[PDB]
Amino acid sequence: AQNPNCNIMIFHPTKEEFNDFDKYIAYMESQGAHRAGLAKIIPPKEWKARETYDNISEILIATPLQQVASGRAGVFTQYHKKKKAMTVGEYRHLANSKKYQTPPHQNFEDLERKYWKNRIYNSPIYGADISGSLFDENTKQWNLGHLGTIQDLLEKECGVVIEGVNTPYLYFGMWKTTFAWHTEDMDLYSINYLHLGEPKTWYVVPPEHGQRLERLARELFPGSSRGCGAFLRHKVALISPTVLKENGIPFNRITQEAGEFMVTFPYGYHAGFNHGFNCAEAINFATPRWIDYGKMASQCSCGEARVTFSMDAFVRILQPERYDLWKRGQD
Numbered sequence: 001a002q003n004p005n006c007n008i009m010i011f012h013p014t015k016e017e018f019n020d021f022d023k024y025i026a027y028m029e030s031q032g033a034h035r036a037g038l039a040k041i042i043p044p045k046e047w048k049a050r051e052t053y054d055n056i057s058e059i060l061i062a063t064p065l066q067q068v069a070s071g072r073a074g075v076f077t078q079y080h081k082k083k084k085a086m087t088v089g090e091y092r093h094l095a096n097s098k099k100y101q102t103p104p105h106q107n108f109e110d111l112e113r114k115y116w117k118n119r120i121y122n123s124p125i126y127g128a129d130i131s132g133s134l135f136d137e138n139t140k141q142w143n144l145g146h147l148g149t150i151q152d153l154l155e156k157e158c159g160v161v162i163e164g165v166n167t168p169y170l171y172f173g174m175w176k177t178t179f180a181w182h183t184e185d186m187d188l189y190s191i192n193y194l195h196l197g198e199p200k201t202w203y204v205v206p207p208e209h210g211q212r213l214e215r216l217a218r219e220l221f222p223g224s225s226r227g228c229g230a231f232l233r234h235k236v237a238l239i240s241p242t243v244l245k246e247n248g249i250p251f252n253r254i255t256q257e258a259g260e261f262m263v264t265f266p267y268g269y270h271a272g273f274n275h276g277f278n279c280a281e282a283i284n285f286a287t288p289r290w291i292d293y294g295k296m297a298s299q300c301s302c303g304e305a306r307v308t309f310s311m312d313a314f315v316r317i318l319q320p321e322r323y324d325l326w327k328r329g330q331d
């Protein structure tokens, strides 16, 4: 078995190997990359996402989210308070202001320490989940807006035609902006490209050990666990690396820098934070190996998790027993 310890692997594809996306995901899996739940892909030196980022200030963040924490430093939940719209230009200025800027620090390790120590006492503002793309239309390789769709994957594998579309999303982050512990909708893969700015630190649990995270989460968020048998789908819970280590949960961490891709694999729980002003683009995708995970994915039916239009068909085809209950939670 390749990568039995479930370490996060880092890949350096050549320009030749960067031509066929599907083939390269399959190659990574042949090397055991999926065991970690997360991989990093450094693009070949000849590749570029776009020519410059000079003209992005006019993108609108229609609903910036202020991330307000409750709990203790290592075990907290966060809720999103909607703020008034602002442009990327305005957001970047806000990120760099004395109230929100990255503090002085020695290295990534020191900054991580300051994150887990102090995150709960601040409420950073995240421009998340903005439909759109920053890839140049002429970028042919690993262009997240030109991937084969999940609907076409399901059709190719299962022979059923379904409605739905699959498009990327932009994330504008600042110091301490946080993504809570989650897997993807229907335990899909995700791919995330850090277009510009400061880094993003990631924590991941190997898919083979995801249920150990869930069990600990039920213990740490006992009211939430009573409200819903899949409350991590709400994407509100944070658990620090110190807490995970105390409770023997296997995990890994890695920091993503501008110009790098991360791939999350089916049922790879991940969480993390941004180091300072940045812009990422991410999209879900599927492979044939995903199908069995989609059939087994937990679902939130309490009403909180509320997701896209396109998830309907996935639940309807892959999880027909669950469909009625799940849809009641959507409606």
Ligand SMILES: O=C(O)CNC(=O)C(=O)O
Pocket (backbone or CB within 6 Å): 171, 178, 179, 190, 191, 192, 264, 270, 280, 282, 283
């Ligand atoms: O970048 C973020 O805020 C969150 N991204 C992801 O969870 C992902 O790409 O799967």
Ligand SMILES: [Mg+2]
Pocket (backbone or CB within 6 Å): 055, 056, 057, 058, 059
């Ligand atoms: Mg613009």
Ligand code: NI
Pocket (backbone or CB within 6 Å): 182, 183, 184, 190, 264, 270
């Ligand atoms: Ni994710």
Ligand SMILES: [Zn+2]
Pocket (backbone or CB within 6 Å): 227, 228, 229, 230, 231, 233, 234, 300, 301, 302, 303, 304, 305
């Ligand atoms: Zn729920």
